[PDB]
Design a protein around this nucleic acid. Structure first.
Lengths: 77, 149, 272, 46
RNA sequence: AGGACCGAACCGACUAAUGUUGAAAAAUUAGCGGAUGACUUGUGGCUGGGGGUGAAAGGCCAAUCAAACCGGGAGAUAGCU
RNA sequence: GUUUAUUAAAAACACAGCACUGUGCAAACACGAAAGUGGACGUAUACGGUGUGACGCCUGCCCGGUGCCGGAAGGUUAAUU
RNA sequence: CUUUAAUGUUUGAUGUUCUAACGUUGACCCGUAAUCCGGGUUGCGGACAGUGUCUGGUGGGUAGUUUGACUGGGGCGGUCU
């Protein structure tokens, strides 16, 4: 995991390229905020995995689409 | 994230006109009580129409917290029955679940949730001072009076 | 009491035991005996991760009531026993309402005495009170950290976390760790010392007493090789680096604390 | 003195049989390569 | 009672004689120490190679250990024989 | 008692004690992709790691450098506004 | 300009404080007469520990490499135009 449920993004490959320009790998990691929300139609709390700049993604698209992928995954809450 | 904020009170509140705001104000503080509508850019022109109709109705739903600010900042004895020991020991106490739901502030809930409480409330029968959430941001005294069940 | 050996062989020269004529010289009554087992310092991985803990005797486990909180039901105190799993003695307390527990000894052990709770009732040793209602100079048994967290401080035989002020909204107490905390008055705590006050007259006198306690021996770092331990020495030991752990931490240094959640209550800490 | 092979087949059976290794991916690739080579003793647990 | 003792059975091998293209994975024969314990120890189980595990020798990890074994990289590379 | 299976079997290793220090327990520490678990479900009369080595008499000067902790009034100071 | 009051104005820093995010190998009810897991509640911390991005200090604890020819062989020594 460490999946941003809302953009479908993940960690991804990338090399450091240090001050001596060395190509040691570090790999880049999404900030991956594990974040709670409220849904008026169920009158319950849902937890959706969000990243950095992930909040503007949930607003502009809608909670509803993200929430339907949690239903699709099979998980309980 | 932006929203279209429908509250009029507190630190931000422009009654149904769009004003872009930080993301801790947007969604999570307001939507557990349905106080904002998303800036999703599918309905935002309708939302800015809808407010002209809505606000005078919406303003009376936003006269709910004013009661609480009247009725606790000028304090009287909130009378609560709780389970006493043989020596007046409040085993059970009032705490967070009796201070939320039976208080005369608006006679309604403020969502019981998490609270900071840096030490207890209520530990023997009789009156005592209890500083609790008349509003989400605003900590103020009520006076309690406890009697036996 | 204490029994010290007459030095009838080497290795029995400095060996000392804790004995009391009242101790049950049986095995405890087993339907109520609640199974220890050890993990010998091995974690989920099947690797030894807390080093040099491993071995010894089976050392069975009792549930123990570690707040001693009870409203007004009398206790006959059916036996006081040695406990193989901690320093302090553990009673089978038998309450007259027909409830059996195992319970941590206080300075009290009185037959037919009652464990009370609530302010006007509690006053004999072992009878629980909210911390507001206990006097200054009191040694205190088993301190609740935050209301509902239970008696996590002073559990080992004869230790205490002594009240030394009570001014303001908090009660100030000092710990035998050298720590000094403020703790809120709404916490529960209990009267008297911790029981088994004679434990401290142990001298062990053989490596085998710690061996049965599940404590394994540990080599000098300066007597390991540089490859086997980061400190390790050369040809004829050659002590003269700065001392280190096997993982690079300074043994005579560091403040390693990052709990950052209960830190409002510690008003002074141990310091280098 | 003492030699490195000794009795107990018990220490073989759960290391080096079938059903518990088929349950995993990696266990199946030992079993795949062995079947594909043409070796008649598939786990030697017989 | 005993991290005590002389000592088989039971386990080890400080030293000595021998062996060294031995019967031998230091065994044998003789002196010798643990065995009322931090001893001797059967069964079932687990950690995977600069990784384990070490009351410490950079010990031991499938007749093997200051660098296990195999299958690919691989016809490594060789400034050198 | 332990010890390089076969060069030591001890002058090294261990230990109670003795000195130094970390840790207030979701501990210090450790290993693991991280959850997590062990420590210990015990907890400062307790647990890790360090130096020294039961016991009698003791341990005078000194932090400079070496590793390491910590504090503050502030001159400047990356990234950064 | 220096110090600087009244104070118009934008942004960076600060204290004190709330619960409303966020934290919970605290506890309780519940799914569930499943110590897990998850939401809730309640005890307590709290816009902080945390983690990512950016970047600078420290740091052999760790891993990969590296550390002259010449020269009556040479180490060393002395010299290299």
């Amino acid at each position: 995991s460490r999946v941003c449920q809302v953009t479908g993004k993940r960690p991804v490959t990338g090399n450091n390229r240090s001050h001596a320009l060395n190509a040691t790998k570090r790999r880049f990691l999404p900030n991956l905020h594990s974040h709670r929300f409220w849904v008026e139609s169920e009158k319950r709390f849902v937890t959706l995995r969000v990243s950095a700049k992930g909040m503007r993604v949930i607003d502009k698209k809608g909670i509803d689409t993200v929430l339907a992928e949690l239903r699709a995954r099979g998980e309980k809450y | 994230m932006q929203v279209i904020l429908l509250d009029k009170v507190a630190n931000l509140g422009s009654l149904g006109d769009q004003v872009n705001v930080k993301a801790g104000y947007a969604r999570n503080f307001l939507v557990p009580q349905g106080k904002a509508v998303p800036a999703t850019k599918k309905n935002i022109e309708f939302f800015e129409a809808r407010r002209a109709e809505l606000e005078a109705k919406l303003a009376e739903v936003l006269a709910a917290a004013n009661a609480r600010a009247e009725k606790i900042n000028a304090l009287e004895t909130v009378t609560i029955a709780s389970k006493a020991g043989d020596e007046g020991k409040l085993f059970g106490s009032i705490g967070t679940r009796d201070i939320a739901d039976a208080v005369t502030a608006a006679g309604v809930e403020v969502a019981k949730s998490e609270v900071r409480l840096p030490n207890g409330v209520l530990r023997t029968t009789g009156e005592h001072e209890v500083s609790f959430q008349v509003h989400s941001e605003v900590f103020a005294k009520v006076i309690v009076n406890v009697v036996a069940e | 009491a204490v029994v010290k050996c007459k030095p009838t062989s080497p290795g029995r020269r400095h060996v000392v035991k804790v004995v009391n004529p009242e101790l049950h010289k049986g095995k405890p009554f087993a339907p109520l005996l609640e199974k220890n087992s050890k993990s010998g310092g091995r974690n989920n991985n099947g690797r030894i991760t807390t080093r040099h803990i491993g071995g010894g005797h089976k050392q069975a486990y009792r549930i123990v009531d570690f707040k001693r909180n009870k409203d007004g039901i009398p206790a006959v105190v059916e036996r006081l026993e040695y406990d193989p799993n901690r320093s302090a003695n553990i009673a089978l307390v038998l309450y007259k309402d027909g409830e059996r527990r195992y319970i941590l000894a206080p300075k009290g052990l009185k037959a037919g005495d009652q464990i009370q709770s609530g302010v006007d009732a509690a006053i004999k040793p072992g009878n629980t009170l909210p911390m507001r209602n206990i006097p200054v100079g009191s040694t205190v048994h088993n301190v609740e950290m935050k209301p509902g967290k239970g008696g996590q401080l002073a559990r080992s035989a004869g230790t205490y976390v002594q009240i030394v002020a009570r001014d303001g909204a908090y009660v100030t107490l000092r710990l035998r760790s050298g720590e000094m905390r403020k703790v809120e008055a709404d916490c529960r705590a209990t009267l008297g010392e911790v029981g088994n006050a004679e434990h401290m007259l142990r001298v062990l006198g053989k490596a085998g007493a710690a061996r049965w306690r599940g404590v394994r021996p540990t080599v000098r770092g300066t007597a390991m090789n540089p490859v086997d331990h980061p400190h390790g020495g050369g040809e004829g030991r050659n002590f003269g680096k700065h001392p280190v752990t096997p993982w690079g931490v300074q043994t005579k240094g560091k403040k390693t604390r990052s709990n950052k959640r209960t830190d409002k209550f510690i008003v002074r800490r141990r310091s280098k | 003195m003492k030699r490195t092979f000794q009795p107990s087949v018990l220490k073989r059976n759960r290391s080096h049989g079938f059903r518990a290794r088929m349950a995993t991916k990696n266990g199946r690739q030992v079993l795949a390569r062995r079947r594909a080579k043409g070796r008649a003793r598939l786990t030697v647990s017989k």
